[PDB]
Amino acid sequence: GTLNQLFHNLNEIVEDLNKNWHRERRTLHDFADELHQLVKHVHHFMKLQDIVNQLDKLFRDLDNHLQRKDDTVHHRHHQLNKLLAQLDNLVHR
Amino acid sequence: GTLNQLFHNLNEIVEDLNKNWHRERRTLHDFADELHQLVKHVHHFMLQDIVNQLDKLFRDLDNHLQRKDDTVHHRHHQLNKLLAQLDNLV
C-alpha cells in the first residue's frame, strides 16, 4: 500500500535517470565527434603541433570516458530494472 | 523478509551511482579545465575560425557540467528520501 508508493516513486526516478542518460550520451558523443572533426581539420591546415596533439589527447580521453560510461550505465540500468521487477512482484503479491 | 534484500541492494546501487558521479565529475572538469586553457592559449596565439569553434565546445561542455551538477543534486536527494523511507519500512 505504501510499498506501492515507493515503487511508483522509484520507477519515475529510474525513467528520469534513463532519459538523462540518453540526453547526456548524445550531447557527449556529438561533443566528441566535433572534437574529432576539429582534430582532422587542424591536421588539414598545416609550431601548431602542440595544439593538434593536445586536441588529440583530449579526444582520446573523452572517447575512453564514453566507452566506460556505456558499460557502467549498462550495468546499473540492469541492476535497477532487476530491482524494479522485484518490487513489482512484491507489491502485488 | 525480502524487503531487506531490496533495501540493501538499492543502498549499494545508490552508493555506486554516487561514487561514479564524483569520478565522472572530476574526469570531465579536468578535461574542461584543459580545454579552457587551450582556448585561452590559442586566443593569444591568433584561420581563426578554430578558436570560435574551440570556444563553442568549451561552453557546450561547461553548460553540460553545470546542468549535470543540478540534475545529480535533485536525483540523489530523491534517492536519499526513498532509501530513508524504505529502511523505515524494515
Side-chain angles (χ1 to χ4, degrees), chain A residues 2-3 6 9-10 13 17 20 24 27-28 31 34-35 38 42 45 47-48 51 54-55 57-58 61-62 65 69 72 76 79-80 83 86-87 90, chain B residues 2-3 6 9-10 13 17 20 24 27-28 31 34-35 38 41-42 45 47 50 53-54 56-57 60-61 64 68 71 75 78-79 82 85-86 89:
Chain A
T2 291
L3 225 74
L6 299 181
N9 296 349
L10 188 64
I13 294 160
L17 271 52
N20 293 334
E24 177 160 23
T27 302
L28 301 178
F31 189 83
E34 289 206 57
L35 206 51
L38 182 75
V42 172
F45 197 56
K47 185 69 183 293
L48 276 68
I51 317 303
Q54 188 59 236
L55 287 172
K57 186 229 168 199
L58 293 187
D61 287 0
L62 181 65
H65 170 71
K69 194 54 184 305
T72 294
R76 105 194 171 190
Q79 285 313 289
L80 283 158
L83 183 144
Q86 279 154 16
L87 265 186
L90 186 71
Chain B
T2 194
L3 203 63
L6 296 209
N9 290 347
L10 187 53
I13 284 158
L17 213 36
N20 284 327
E24 201 160 324
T27 298
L28 293 168
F31 177 90
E34 289 191 41
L35 177 58
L38 171 45
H41 184 215
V42 184
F45 161 82
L47 180 92
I50 285 162
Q53 182 66 262
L54 268 182
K56 175 190 174 172
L57 288 169
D60 274 354
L61 182 60
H64 171 69
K68 187 89 188 215
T71 300
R75 107 194 141 61
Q78 292 169 313
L79 295 160
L82 202 147
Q85 294 182 327
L86 188 42
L89 283 160

Coordinates of all heavy atoms in Angstrom, one line a residue, chain A residues 2-3 6 9-10 13 17 20 24 27-28 31 34-35 38 42 45 47-48 51 54-55 57-58 61-62 65 69 72 76 79-80 83 86-87 90, chain B residues 2-3 6 9-10 13 17 20 24 27-28 31 34-35 38 41-42 45 47 50 53-54 56-57 60-61 64 68 71 75 78-79 82 85-86 89:
Chain A
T2 N 1.8 1.3 1.0 CA 2.9 2.3 1.0 C 4.0 1.8 0.1 O 4.7 2.5 -0.6 CB 3.4 2.5 2.4 OG1 2.4 3.2 3.2 CG2 4.7 3.3 2.5
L3 N 4.2 0.4 0.1 CA 5.0 -0.2 -0.9 C 4.8 0.2 -2.4 O 5.7 0.3 -3.2 CB 4.9 -1.8 -0.8 CG 6.2 -2.6 -0.8 CD1 6.9 -2.4 0.5 CD2 5.9 -4.1 -1.0
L6 N 6.4 3.7 -3.0 CA 7.8 3.6 -3.3 C 8.2 3.1 -4.7 O 9.2 3.5 -5.3 CB 8.5 2.7 -2.2 CG 8.5 3.1 -0.8 CD1 9.2 2.1 0.1 CD2 9.0 4.5 -0.5
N9 N 7.4 5.8 -7.1 CA 8.5 6.8 -6.9 C 9.8 6.4 -7.5 O 10.5 7.1 -8.2 CB 8.7 7.1 -5.4 CG 7.5 7.8 -4.8 OD1 6.6 8.3 -5.5 ND2 7.5 7.9 -3.5
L10 N 10.2 5.1 -7.3 CA 11.4 4.6 -7.8 C 11.3 4.5 -9.4 O 12.3 4.8 -10.1 CB 11.8 3.3 -7.2 CG 13.2 2.8 -7.5 CD1 14.3 3.7 -7.0 CD2 13.4 1.4 -7.0
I13 N 11.9 7.8 -10.9 CA 13.3 8.2 -10.8 C 14.2 7.4 -11.8 O 15.0 8.0 -12.5 CB 13.9 8.0 -9.3 CG1 13.3 9.0 -8.4 CG2 15.4 8.3 -9.3 CD1 13.4 8.6 -6.9
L17 N 16.4 9.0 -14.8 CA 17.8 8.6 -15.0 C 18.1 8.1 -16.4 O 19.1 8.6 -17.0 CB 18.2 7.5 -14.0 CG 18.7 8.0 -12.6 CD1 17.7 8.9 -11.9 CD2 18.9 6.7 -11.7
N20 N 17.8 11.1 -18.9 CA 19.0 11.9 -18.8 C 20.2 11.3 -19.4 O 20.9 11.9 -20.2 CB 19.4 12.3 -17.3 CG 18.4 13.2 -16.6 OD1 17.7 13.9 -17.3 ND2 18.2 13.1 -15.3
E24 N 22.5 13.0 -22.2 CA 24.0 13.1 -21.9 C 24.7 12.4 -23.0 O 25.6 13.0 -23.7 CB 24.3 12.6 -20.6 CG 25.8 12.6 -20.3 CD 26.2 12.5 -18.8 OE1 25.4 11.9 -18.0 OE2 27.3 12.9 -18.5
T27 N 24.7 14.4 -26.2 CA 25.5 15.6 -26.0 C 27.0 15.3 -26.1 O 27.7 16.0 -26.8 CB 25.1 16.3 -24.7 OG1 23.7 16.6 -24.7 CG2 25.8 17.6 -24.5
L28 N 27.5 14.3 -25.3 CA 28.9 14.0 -25.2 C 29.5 13.3 -26.5 O 30.7 13.5 -26.8 CB 29.1 13.0 -24.0 CG 28.7 13.7 -22.7 CD1 28.9 12.8 -21.5 CD2 29.4 15.0 -22.4
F31 N 29.7 16.1 -29.0 CA 30.8 16.8 -28.5 C 32.1 16.1 -29.0 O 32.9 16.8 -29.7 CB 30.8 16.8 -26.9 CG 31.8 17.7 -26.4 CD1 31.6 19.0 -26.2 CD2 33.1 17.2 -26.0 CE1 32.6 19.9 -25.7 CE2 34.1 18.0 -25.5 CZ 33.8 19.3 -25.3
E34 N 32.6 16.4 -32.9 CA 33.0 17.8 -33.3 C 34.5 18.0 -32.9 O 35.3 18.6 -33.6 CB 32.2 18.8 -32.6 CG 30.8 19.0 -33.1 CD 30.2 20.3 -32.9 OE1 30.8 21.3 -33.3 OE2 29.1 20.4 -32.3
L35 N 34.9 17.4 -31.8 CA 36.3 17.4 -31.4 C 37.2 16.7 -32.4 O 38.2 17.2 -32.9 CB 36.5 16.8 -30.0 CG 37.7 17.2 -29.1 CD1 37.9 18.7 -29.0 CD2 37.5 16.5 -27.8
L38 N 37.4 18.7 -35.7 CA 38.3 19.8 -35.4 C 39.8 19.3 -35.4 O 40.7 20.1 -35.6 CB 37.9 20.5 -34.2 CG 38.6 21.8 -33.6 CD1 38.3 23.0 -34.5 CD2 38.3 22.0 -32.2
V42 N 42.3 20.7 -38.2 CA 43.6 21.3 -37.8 C 44.7 20.6 -38.5 O 45.7 21.2 -39.0 CB 43.8 21.4 -36.3 CG1 45.2 21.8 -35.9 CG2 42.8 22.3 -35.7
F45 N 45.1 21.8 -42.1 CA 45.5 23.2 -42.2 C 47.1 23.3 -42.5 O 47.5 24.3 -43.2 CB 45.2 23.9 -40.9 CG 45.2 25.4 -41.0 CD1 44.5 26.1 -42.0 CD2 46.0 26.1 -40.1 CE1 44.5 27.5 -42.0 CE2 46.0 27.5 -40.2 CZ 45.3 28.2 -41.1
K47 N 55.1 23.8 -34.5 CA 54.5 25.2 -34.4 C 53.1 25.1 -34.0 O 52.8 25.6 -32.8 CB 54.7 25.8 -35.8 CG 54.2 27.3 -35.9 CD 55.2 28.2 -35.1 CE 54.7 29.6 -35.1 NZ 54.8 30.2 -36.5
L48 N 52.2 24.6 -34.8 CA 50.7 24.4 -34.4 C 50.5 23.0 -33.9 O 49.4 22.5 -33.8 CB 49.8 24.6 -35.7 CG 49.4 26.1 -35.9 CD1 50.5 27.0 -36.4 CD2 48.3 26.1 -37.0
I51 N 49.0 22.2 -30.3 CA 47.6 22.4 -30.3 C 46.9 21.1 -30.8 O 46.0 20.5 -30.0 CB 47.1 23.6 -31.2 CG1 48.0 24.8 -31.1 CG2 45.7 23.9 -31.0 CD1 48.2 25.4 -29.7
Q54 N 47.4 18.1 -28.4 CA 46.6 18.3 -27.2 C 45.2 18.0 -27.4 O 44.5 17.5 -26.6 CB 46.8 19.8 -26.7 CG 46.2 20.0 -25.3 CD 46.7 19.2 -24.2 OE1 45.9 18.5 -23.5 NE2 48.0 19.2 -24.0
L55 N 44.7 18.4 -28.6 CA 43.3 18.1 -29.0 C 43.1 16.6 -29.2 O 42.1 16.0 -28.9 CB 42.9 18.8 -30.3 CG 42.6 20.3 -30.1 CD1 42.4 20.9 -31.5 CD2 41.4 20.6 -29.2
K57 N 44.9 14.2 -27.7 CA 44.9 13.7 -26.3 C 43.5 13.8 -25.7 O 43.0 12.9 -25.1 CB 45.9 14.5 -25.4 CG 46.0 13.9 -24.0 CD 45.9 15.0 -22.9 CE 45.7 14.4 -21.5 NZ 45.2 15.4 -20.6
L58 N 42.9 15.0 -25.9 CA 41.6 15.3 -25.3 C 40.5 14.5 -25.9 O 39.7 13.9 -25.2 CB 41.3 16.8 -25.3 CG 42.1 17.8 -24.5 CD1 41.5 19.2 -24.5 CD2 42.2 17.3 -23.0
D61 N 40.9 10.9 -24.4 CA 40.4 10.9 -23.0 C 38.9 10.8 -22.9 O 38.4 9.9 -22.2 CB 40.8 12.2 -22.3 CG 42.3 12.3 -21.9 OD1 43.0 11.3 -22.2 OD2 42.7 13.3 -21.4
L62 N 38.2 11.6 -23.6 CA 36.8 11.6 -23.8 C 36.2 10.4 -24.3 O 35.4 9.7 -23.8 CB 36.3 12.8 -24.6 CG 34.8 13.0 -24.9 CD1 34.1 13.4 -23.6 CD2 34.6 14.1 -25.9
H65 N 36.5 7.8 -21.9 CA 35.4 8.1 -20.9 C 34.1 7.6 -21.3 O 33.3 7.1 -20.5 CB 35.4 9.6 -20.5 CG 34.2 9.9 -19.7 ND1 34.0 9.5 -18.4 CD2 33.0 10.5 -20.0 CE1 32.9 9.9 -17.9 NE2 32.2 10.5 -18.9
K69 N 31.7 4.8 -19.7 CA 30.3 5.2 -19.3 C 29.3 4.3 -19.8 O 28.5 3.8 -19.1 CB 30.0 6.7 -19.7 CG 28.8 7.3 -19.1 CD 28.8 7.3 -17.5 CE 27.6 7.8 -16.9 NZ 27.2 9.2 -17.3
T72 N 29.1 1.1 -17.7 CA 28.7 1.4 -16.4 C 27.2 1.6 -16.2 O 26.6 1.1 -15.4 CB 29.5 2.6 -15.9 OG1 30.9 2.2 -15.8 CG2 29.1 3.1 -14.5
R76 N 24.4 -0.6 -14.3 CA 23.4 0.0 -13.3 C 22.0 -0.1 -13.7 O 21.0 -0.3 -12.9 CB 23.8 1.4 -13.0 CG 22.9 2.5 -13.6 CD 23.4 3.9 -13.5 NE 22.7 4.9 -14.3 CZ 23.0 6.1 -14.6 NH1 24.2 6.6 -14.2 NH2 22.2 6.9 -15.3
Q79 N 20.7 -3.5 -13.1 CA 20.6 -3.7 -11.7 C 19.4 -3.0 -11.2 O 18.7 -3.6 -10.3 CB 21.8 -3.3 -10.9 CG 23.0 -4.3 -11.0 CD 22.7 -5.8 -10.8 OE1 22.3 -6.2 -9.7 NE2 22.7 -6.5 -11.9
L80 N 19.0 -1.8 -11.7 CA 17.8 -1.1 -11.3 C 16.5 -1.7 -11.9 O 15.5 -1.7 -11.2 CB 17.9 0.4 -11.7 CG 18.7 1.2 -10.7 CD1 19.2 2.5 -11.4 CD2 18.0 1.4 -9.3
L83 N 15.8 -4.9 -9.9 CA 15.3 -4.5 -8.6 C 13.8 -3.9 -8.7 O 13.0 -4.2 -7.8 CB 16.2 -3.4 -8.0 CG 15.8 -2.8 -6.7 CD1 17.0 -2.6 -5.8 CD2 15.0 -1.5 -6.8
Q86 N 11.5 -6.9 -9.0 CA 11.3 -7.5 -7.7 C 10.3 -6.7 -6.9 O 9.4 -7.3 -6.3 CB 12.7 -7.6 -7.0 CG 13.5 -8.8 -7.5 CD 15.0 -8.6 -7.3 OE1 15.5 -7.7 -6.6 NE2 15.7 -9.5 -8.0
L87 N 10.4 -5.4 -6.9 CA 9.4 -4.6 -6.3 C 8.0 -4.9 -6.8 O 7.1 -5.1 -6.1 CB 9.7 -3.1 -6.4 CG 10.5 -2.4 -5.2 CD1 10.5 -0.9 -5.5 CD2 9.8 -2.6 -3.9
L90 N 6.7 -8.0 -5.5 CA 6.5 -7.9 -4.0 C 5.2 -7.1 -3.6 O 4.5 -7.4 -2.7 CB 7.7 -7.4 -3.3 CG 7.7 -7.4 -1.8 CD1 7.8 -8.8 -1.3 CD2 8.8 -6.6 -1.3
Chain B
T2 N 11.9 -10.3 2.5 CA 12.7 -10.0 1.3 C 12.8 -8.5 0.9 O 13.5 -8.1 0.0 CB 12.1 -10.9 0.1 OG1 13.1 -10.8 -1.0 CG2 10.8 -10.4 -0.4
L3 N 12.0 -7.7 1.6 CA 12.2 -6.2 1.5 C 13.5 -5.7 2.1 O 14.0 -4.6 1.9 CB 11.0 -5.5 2.2 CG 10.7 -4.1 1.8 CD1 10.3 -3.9 0.3 CD2 9.6 -3.5 2.6
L6 N 16.0 -6.1 -1.0 CA 15.7 -4.9 -1.8 C 16.2 -3.6 -1.3 O 16.7 -2.8 -2.1 CB 14.2 -4.8 -2.0 CG 13.5 -5.9 -2.8 CD1 12.3 -5.4 -3.6 CD2 14.4 -6.7 -3.8
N9 N 20.2 -3.9 -1.5 CA 20.6 -3.8 -2.9 C 20.5 -2.4 -3.5 O 21.4 -1.9 -4.2 CB 19.7 -4.7 -3.7 CG 19.9 -6.2 -3.5 OD1 20.9 -6.6 -2.9 ND2 19.0 -7.0 -4.0
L10 N 19.5 -1.6 -3.1 CA 19.3 -0.3 -3.5 C 20.3 0.7 -2.9 O 20.8 1.6 -3.5 CB 17.9 0.2 -3.1 CG 17.4 1.6 -3.6 CD1 17.6 1.7 -5.2 CD2 16.0 1.8 -3.2
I13 N 23.5 0.2 -4.8 CA 23.3 0.8 -6.1 C 23.5 2.3 -6.1 O 24.1 3.0 -7.0 CB 21.9 0.5 -6.7 CG1 21.8 -1.0 -7.3 CG2 21.5 1.4 -7.9 CD1 20.4 -1.5 -7.3
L17 N 26.3 4.7 -7.8 CA 25.9 5.9 -8.5 C 26.7 7.2 -8.1 O 27.3 7.9 -9.0 CB 24.4 6.1 -8.3 CG 23.5 6.7 -9.4 CD1 23.9 6.3 -10.8 CD2 22.1 6.3 -9.1
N20 N 30.4 6.9 -8.8 CA 30.7 7.1 -10.2 C 30.5 8.4 -10.7 O 31.1 8.8 -11.7 CB 29.9 6.1 -11.0 CG 30.4 4.6 -11.0 OD1 31.6 4.4 -10.8 ND2 29.5 3.7 -11.1
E24 N 33.2 10.7 -12.5 CA 32.8 11.4 -13.7 C 33.1 12.8 -13.6 O 33.6 13.4 -14.6 CB 31.2 11.2 -13.7 CG 30.6 11.4 -15.1 CD 29.2 10.7 -15.1 OE1 29.1 9.6 -14.5 OE2 28.3 11.2 -15.7
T27 N 36.8 13.8 -13.8 CA 37.3 13.5 -15.2 C 36.9 14.6 -16.1 O 37.7 15.1 -16.9 CB 36.8 12.1 -15.6 OG1 37.3 11.1 -14.7 CG2 37.3 11.8 -17.0
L28 N 35.6 15.0 -16.1 CA 35.2 16.0 -17.1 C 35.5 17.4 -16.7 O 35.7 18.2 -17.6 CB 33.6 15.8 -17.3 CG 33.2 14.6 -18.0 CD1 31.7 14.4 -17.9 CD2 33.7 14.5 -19.4
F31 N 39.1 17.8 -17.8 CA 39.0 17.8 -19.2 C 38.6 19.2 -19.7 O 39.2 19.7 -20.7 CB 38.1 16.7 -19.7 CG 37.8 16.7 -21.1 CD1 38.6 16.0 -21.9 CD2 36.8 17.5 -21.6 CE1 38.4 16.0 -23.3 CE2 36.5 17.5 -23.0 CZ 37.4 16.8 -23.8
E34 N 41.5 22.0 -19.1 CA 42.4 22.0 -20.2 C 41.9 22.7 -21.4 O 42.5 23.7 -21.8 CB 42.8 20.5 -20.5 CG 43.7 19.9 -19.5 CD 44.3 18.6 -19.9 OE1 44.7 18.5 -21.1 OE2 44.3 17.6 -19.1
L35 N 40.7 22.2 -21.9 CA 40.1 22.9 -23.0 C 40.0 24.4 -22.9 O 40.3 25.1 -23.8 CB 38.6 22.3 -23.1 CG 37.7 22.9 -24.1 CD1 38.3 22.7 -25.5 CD2 36.3 22.2 -24.1
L38 N 43.5 25.8 -23.2 CA 43.8 25.7 -24.6 C 43.2 26.8 -25.4 O 43.9 27.6 -26.1 CB 43.3 24.3 -25.1 CG 43.3 23.9 -26.6 CD1 44.6 24.4 -27.2 CD2 43.2 22.4 -26.8
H41 N 45.0 29.9 -24.7 CA 46.3 29.9 -25.3 C 46.2 30.3 -26.8 O 46.8 31.3 -27.2 CB 46.9 28.5 -25.2 CG 48.3 28.4 -25.8 ND1 48.8 27.3 -26.4 CD2 49.3 29.3 -25.8 CE1 50.0 27.5 -26.8 NE2 50.4 28.8 -26.5
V42 N 45.4 29.6 -27.5 CA 45.2 29.8 -29.0 C 44.7 31.3 -29.2 O 45.2 31.9 -30.1 CB 44.3 28.8 -29.7 CG1 44.2 29.1 -31.2 CG2 44.7 27.4 -29.4
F45 N 47.5 33.2 -29.2 CA 48.3 32.8 -30.4 C 47.8 33.5 -31.7 O 48.6 33.9 -32.6 CB 48.3 31.3 -30.6 CG 48.6 30.8 -32.0 CD1 49.9 30.7 -32.4 CD2 47.6 30.4 -32.9 CE1 50.2 30.3 -33.7 CE2 47.9 30.0 -34.2 CZ 49.2 29.9 -34.6
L47 N 41.4 30.1 -40.6 CA 42.5 30.7 -39.8 C 42.1 30.7 -38.3 O 42.5 29.8 -37.5 CB 42.8 32.1 -40.3 CG 43.9 32.9 -39.6 CD1 45.2 32.6 -40.3 CD2 43.6 34.4 -39.6
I50 N 38.8 28.6 -35.8 CA 39.0 27.4 -35.0 C 38.9 27.8 -33.5 O 38.4 26.9 -32.7 CB 40.4 26.8 -35.3 CG1 40.4 26.0 -36.6 CG2 40.9 25.9 -34.1 CD1 41.7 25.7 -37.2
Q53 N 35.1 27.9 -32.9 CA 34.7 26.5 -32.7 C 35.2 26.0 -31.3 O 34.5 25.3 -30.6 CB 35.1 25.6 -33.8 CG 34.7 24.1 -33.7 CD 33.2 23.9 -33.8 OE1 32.5 23.8 -32.8 NE2 32.7 23.9 -35.0
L54 N 36.4 26.3 -31.0 CA 37.0 25.9 -29.7 C 36.3 26.5 -28.5 O 35.9 25.8 -27.6 CB 38.5 26.2 -29.7 CG 39.5 25.1 -30.2 CD1 40.9 25.5 -30.0 CD2 39.3 23.8 -29.4
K56 N 33.3 27.6 -28.7 CA 31.9 26.9 -28.7 C 31.9 25.6 -27.9 O 30.9 25.4 -27.2 CB 31.4 26.6 -30.1 CG 30.1 25.9 -30.1 CD 29.7 25.3 -31.5 CE 28.4 24.5 -31.4 NZ 27.9 24.1 -32.7
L57 N 32.8 24.8 -28.2 CA 32.9 23.5 -27.5 C 33.1 23.7 -25.9 O 32.4 23.1 -25.2 CB 34.1 22.6 -28.0 CG 33.8 22.0 -29.4 CD1 35.1 21.4 -29.9 CD2 32.8 20.9 -29.3
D60 N 29.7 24.6 -24.6 CA 29.0 23.4 -24.8 C 29.2 22.4 -23.5 O 28.2 22.1 -22.8 CB 29.4 22.6 -26.0 CG 28.7 23.0 -27.3 OD1 27.8 23.9 -27.3 OD2 29.1 22.5 -28.4
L61 N 30.4 22.1 -23.2 CA 30.7 21.3 -22.0 C 30.5 22.0 -20.7 O 30.0 21.3 -19.7 CB 32.2 20.8 -22.1 CG 32.7 19.9 -20.9 CD1 31.8 18.6 -20.8 CD2 34.1 19.5 -21.1
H64 N 26.8 21.8 -20.1 CA 26.5 20.4 -19.7 C 26.9 20.1 -18.2 O 26.1 19.4 -17.6 CB 27.2 19.4 -20.6 CG 27.1 18.0 -20.1 ND1 26.0 17.3 -20.2 CD2 28.1 17.2 -19.6 CE1 26.2 16.1 -19.6 NE2 27.4 16.0 -19.3
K68 N 24.4 19.2 -15.2 CA 24.6 17.9 -14.6 C 24.7 18.0 -13.0 O 24.1 17.2 -12.3 CB 25.9 17.3 -15.1 CG 26.2 15.9 -14.6 CD 25.6 14.8 -15.5 CE 25.8 13.5 -14.8 NZ 26.0 12.3 -15.6
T71 N 21.0 18.4 -11.9 CA 20.3 17.1 -12.1 C 20.7 16.1 -11.1 O 19.9 15.3 -10.6 CB 20.7 16.5 -13.5 OG1 20.3 17.5 -14.5 CG2 20.0 15.2 -13.8
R75 N 18.4 14.2 -8.2 CA 18.2 12.8 -8.2 C 18.6 12.1 -6.9 O 17.9 11.4 -6.4 CB 18.9 12.1 -9.5 CG 20.1 11.2 -9.1 CD 21.0 10.8 -10.3 NE 22.4 10.9 -9.9 CZ 23.0 10.2 -8.9 NH1 22.3 9.3 -8.2 NH2 24.3 10.4 -8.6
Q78 N 16.3 12.9 -4.1 CA 15.2 12.0 -4.3 C 15.5 10.6 -3.8 O 14.8 10.0 -3.0 CB 14.7 11.8 -5.7 CG 14.0 13.1 -6.3 CD 13.8 12.9 -7.8 OE1 14.8 12.5 -8.5 NE2 12.7 13.2 -8.3
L79 N 16.6 10.0 -4.2 CA 17.0 8.6 -3.8 C 17.3 8.5 -2.3 O 17.1 7.4 -1.7 CB 18.2 8.2 -4.6 CG 18.0 8.1 -6.1 CD1 19.3 8.2 -6.9 CD2 17.2 6.8 -6.4
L82 N 13.9 8.3 -0.6 CA 13.4 7.0 -0.9 C 14.0 5.9 0.0 O 13.3 5.1 0.6 CB 13.5 6.6 -2.4 CG 12.6 5.6 -2.9 CD1 12.3 5.9 -4.4 CD2 13.2 4.2 -2.8
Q85 N 13.0 6.2 3.6 CA 11.6 5.6 3.7 C 11.6 4.1 3.6 O 10.9 3.4 4.4 CB 10.8 6.0 2.5 CG 10.5 7.5 2.6 CD 9.7 8.0 1.4 OE1 9.7 7.4 0.3 NE2 8.8 9.0 1.7
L86 N 12.4 3.5 2.7 CA 12.5 2.1 2.5 C 13.0 1.4 3.8 O 12.4 0.4 4.2 CB 13.3 1.8 1.3 CG 13.4 0.3 0.9 CD1 12.0 -0.4 0.9 CD2 14.0 0.2 -0.5
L89 N 10.5 1.3 6.6 CA 9.6 0.1 6.4 C 10.2 -1.2 6.8 O 9.4 -2.2 6.8 CB 9.1 0.1 5.0 CG 8.1 1.1 4.6 CD1 8.1 1.2 3.1 CD2 6.7 0.7 5.1

